[PDB]
Amino acid sequence: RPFLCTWAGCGKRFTRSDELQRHKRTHTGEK
Ligand SMILES: [Zn+2]
C-alpha cells in the first residue's frame, strides 16, 4: 500500500502513513 498526497496538484508519494500525514500538515498550515 503506497501513500500518495492527492492534494490540489501535489502528488507526493510516501511509504509511511505518518510521513503522509506529517506532510499533509504543510498544506493545512500546521506549523
Ligand atoms: Zn502534498
Cell numbers standing for residue 21? 500525514
d(CA 15, CA 31): 22
d(CA 12, CA 9): 9
SS3 28: helix
Are 19 and 11 in contact by the 8 Å Cβ rule? The answer is: no
Calculate Rg over the CA atoms of the chain. 9
- What technique determined this structure? NMR
Are 16 and 2 in contact by the 8 Å Cβ rule? The answer is: no
Q: For the chain, what is the domain count?
A: 1
| Interval between CA 12 and ligand 1 midpoint (Å) | 6
Counting Cα atoms < 13 Å in the Cβ hemisphere of 5 gives 20
End-to-end Cα separation, the chain, in angstroms: 28
| Interval between CA 14 and ligand 1 midpoint (Å) | 10
Count of residues making up the chain: 31
Partners of 13 in beta bridges:
4
| Interval between CA 29 and ligand 1 midpoint (Å) | 12
- Note down the domain range covering 25: 1-31
13 Cβ partners below 8 Å, 6+ apart?
A: 2, 3, 4, 5
